[PDB]
Amino acid sequence: MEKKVLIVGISQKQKDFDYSMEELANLAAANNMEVVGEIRQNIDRENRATYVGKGKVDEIKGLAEMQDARLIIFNDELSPSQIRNLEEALELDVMDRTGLILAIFANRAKTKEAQLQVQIAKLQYELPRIFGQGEDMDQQSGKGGLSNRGSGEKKIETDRRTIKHQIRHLQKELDMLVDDREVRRRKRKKNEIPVVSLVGYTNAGKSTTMNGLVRAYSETADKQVFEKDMLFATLETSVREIVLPDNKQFLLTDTVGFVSKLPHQLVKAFRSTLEEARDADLLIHVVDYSDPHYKTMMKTTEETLKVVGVEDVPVIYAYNKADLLEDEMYPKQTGNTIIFSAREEESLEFLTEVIRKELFASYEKATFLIPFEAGQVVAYLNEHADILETEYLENGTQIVAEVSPADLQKLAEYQVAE
Amino acid sequence: MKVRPSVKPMCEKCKVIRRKGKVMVICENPKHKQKQ
Amino acid sequence: LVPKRVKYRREFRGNMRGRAKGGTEVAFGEYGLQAVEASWITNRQIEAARIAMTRYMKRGGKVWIKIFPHKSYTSKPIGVRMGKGKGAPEGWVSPVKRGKIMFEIAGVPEDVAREALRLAAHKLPVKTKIVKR
């Protein structure tokens, strides 16, 4: 059924501390749990032993036993000794934000890449905590003496080695999977298709933008990407063709969303996943302009991109949800900023116009004379470049069109000087 | 070649034959070559 | 598929001797899967088979599940010895005897029905066959 939980937080000199508890409640509501009470404390430093102090523990226990809760959720990462102390004091179950995010990710992992990533993150998180957890059985006080027969080791060494071993096996499987993944990018790298990637915060509107663009400018436009409010809807990346009316081709990629106060054991998984965004040719930053806190989001967004390791890539900041705001006109371009609504034909037209302006800038005018009997080149021009005017001459076809340097070099014999 | 316990046709031009006591599939598409 | 409540939390495992008592004929739809052997069938297997065979038909026609997981089973963790009482319940199971019809479908032609039942039968731990009313 649904479990009853509590959420506990300290001010800790955070600048807001209120959106943090709001999003913690939202995350709990995304794990088939409901918040039946929150406790906050305005302490500028974190308690070393119980994270809240002596009196707050009793207050929390009283509220939990009055509201009939089954678990307590703490807004920040805990310590193994803190977990031991809180569990002993409360006589309940204790869980922290990192555990909550891992729980959210575990049951939404479909492809085994995500499943293995979450598995390794969970084992890495639980590895330091097993010390006092297993000492209760290990610290049996009475075990023996000198024996002249034995393992030549103490039990702590043995169980440390056992827990250390399996981590390497799981990481090895991860590495093999990523190496296999690099095989499927061979065709993209061998050719030189430009790539543009959508990034941003969660529920910003990336998937809707991608679906609109795909419906507008794709051959197999029936290939849509899932969209919803919920929570981390897309846990996988997608790549699609986009072909423009002026006969230009590029690839559009979609990736996952993130949230503030992100665990460090899972940022490695995100760094593995965002490897397509790392080698992108253009970045589109979707921002939910309607949300008042959106500004804060932008900062934390760059922070994530600073950690996975994507930099020096041109970025266009797109402000979604323009229709939800009153007394505003859209689409509009200001510097490297776009104001638009994803569910609009004209907004998508403006965004794709901006993309075409930014990426393709080395398509210059050129004139070619293709002889009639030696034809089969006008088709290449029309299906690989945008033409302006062609003429039916007695000696052949006189075409003028704007092309790329590769086309110029390939068609260097047909050029005519002026 | 694909070496599997479950050799079966993959298109409508695949053909199932036996050679040296082994079941196998031949086709015009070389990706469809299977041996059991 | 889990029962809402039970009178007892622990139960004997039972046996599977003999032919199925009832439910050996197609009674609602036109097509059915019949068990040829006996087996425990869990609710994960039922759910996987149902999703496969329903997705193939694109939510057309009707599907009837003729078995329910009434029985529960327990287990013991790694590292515990024998004794000290019975273990904790894990899942829910249906014991299926030979001859039992466990899935029925209607509302689709021969080809769709037979292919959906073939797709479903590969998710199950028992040896099956396809029968028509």
Binding site: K187, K190, N191, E192, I193, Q249 | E28 | -
Partner: protein, 177 residues
């Protein structure tokens, strides 16, 4: 066996004889000798050869058919003969011969040399055209296959050595963009 029941009409100038299971065929172009299993039997008269089938079971049917086919090919090869033709495709691909030795320049750092065995001959109408001739199906086929195996055709340009009756499966070097 429909094949096994068909009659063999002996052409003029070729003679066929039986020594037990062994069969010998002579004519304008050469002499052949071959051994068959005794379970099958052959009749002899002026201008017809008939191979008969004692039993109707599997291997016996197959042997009947293949015995008739082998006799037919043997007699035809002695009488008229057999040939195969080979083409070379590619820039610089050259076929030549010095006496009784075929020399191929097919893109390696060294030329490839071929010498025909007894009963088989190699002819070079043009620098990119080879012909294998002989009065034995198996040997002509084997030598043509050996020559072709030096540089079989490749799917990106068609270059290599191929039969005239070959359709090469063609692929495109660069696709996707």
């Amino acid at each position: 066996s429909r094949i096994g029941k068909k009659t063999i009409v002996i052409p003029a100038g070729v003679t066929v004889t039986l020594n037990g299971s062994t069969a010998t065929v002579k004519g304008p172009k050469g002499e052949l000798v071959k051994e068959f299993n005794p379970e099958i039997t052959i009749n002899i008269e002026g201008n017809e050869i008939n191979v008969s089938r004692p039993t109707d079971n599997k291997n016996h049917r197959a042997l009947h058919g293949t015995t008739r086919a082998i006799l037919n090919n043997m007699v035809v090869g002695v009488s008229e003969g057999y040939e195969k033709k080979l083409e070379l495709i590619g820039v610089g691909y050259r076929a030549q011969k010095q006496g009784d030795k075929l020399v191929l320049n097919v893109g390696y750092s060294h030329p490839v040399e071929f010498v025909a065995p007894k009963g088989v001959e190699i002819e070079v109408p043009a620098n990119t055209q080879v012909i294998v001739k002989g009065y034995n199906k198996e040997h002509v086929g084997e030598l043509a296959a050996n020559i072709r195996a030096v540089r079989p055709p490749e799917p990106y340009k068609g270059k290599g050595i191929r039969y005239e009756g070959e359709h090469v499966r063609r692929k495109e070097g660069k696709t996707g963009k």
